[PDB]
């Protein structure tokens, strides 16, 4: 393991072979989840880029976050998908935090601290365990099958993920940069592989 504190991955040029892979000790099926991460890129209103991907042996889009051109953020689970609309686009580092629950079937999507309206999606359905969490490129299969058009060019870091659902106070503390303890993917005790042109450099954002 290693501590990525005050560190960030950098993808210099667009391609279809540079990517990192994050491993997890998960063993039992998931009935809820929450993820949080910071990222910064200039793609903006030029093309769509992948943010976070989570596939399995029978589904390429078990969990996925995308930036649909002129549409806004797209959050998809187990095939089904919803799209949170953003009217205008800026150029600055952004922090996002999404959470989903099975029984309730409600999705929450906090962007830059402010919350968005709640929505329903995929009520009563579980998520597999064997997973391949690739970062940098969207996947249409468990392994590679990347598409260069959907690659990401920029910086990303501070990737955390809990199995249960956080509360608004907890999310606010996360945003302010306080202590906490993940249980699935911990940025302070990460374990990863990397291939291609990927660099590790200090994070620009505060």
């Amino acid at each position: 393991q290693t501590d990525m504190s005050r560190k960030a991955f950098v993808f210099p040029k667009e391609s279809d072979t540079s990517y990192v892979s994050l491993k997890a000790p998960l063993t039992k099926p998931l009935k809820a989840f929450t993820v949080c991460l910071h990222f910064y890129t200039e793609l903006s209103s030029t093309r769509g880029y992948s943010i976070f991907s989570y596939a399995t042996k029978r589904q390429d889009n078990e969990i996925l976050i995308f930036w649909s051109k002129d549409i806004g953020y797209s959050f998809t689970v187990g095939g089904s998908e919803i799209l949170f609309e953003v009217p205008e686009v800026t150029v600055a580092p952004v922090h996002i935090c999404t959470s989903w629950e099975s029984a309730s079937g409600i999705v929450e999507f906090w962007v830059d601290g402010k919350p968005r309206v709640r929505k329903s999606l995929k009520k009563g359905y579980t998520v597999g365990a064997e997973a391949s969490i690739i970062l940098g490129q969207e996947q249409d299969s468990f392994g590679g099958n990347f598409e260069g058009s959907q690659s990401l060019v920029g910086d990303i870091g501070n990737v955390n993920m809990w199995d249960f659902v956080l509360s608004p106070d907890e999310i606010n503390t996360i945003y302010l940069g306080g202590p906490f303890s993940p249980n699935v993917l911990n940025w302070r005790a990460l374990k990863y592989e990397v291939q291609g042109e990927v660099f590790t450099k200090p994070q620009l954002w505060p």
Partner: nanobody
Amino acid sequence: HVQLVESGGGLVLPGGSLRLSCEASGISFSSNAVGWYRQAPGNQRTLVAVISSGGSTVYGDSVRGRFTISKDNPKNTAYLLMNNLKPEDTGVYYCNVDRRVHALPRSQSYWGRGTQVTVSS
């Protein structure tokens, strides 16, 4: 294989209404998103109304709050109800399906023949 069948189209006098149906086979709307695109100069399809698998929908800027689109998984059919159409709305319409709403269409996305609509007075 995959076949897309369009129905419910024609010509009507100004101010009337109509309804389009884009039935599909082989593919399933449960894990896909559908949408209707208009004709324009060159090869530029223009966004009209699209419904994603989850349920969220996106309507065209000009047609904001004019028509209503809806879907039905049981019979896997999408219906677009057009009402209060002006003469300029006449032209060529297509209904396509793709794994995810993608604004400006993409190559792989099936197109599904087409249809003609006239707003002749």
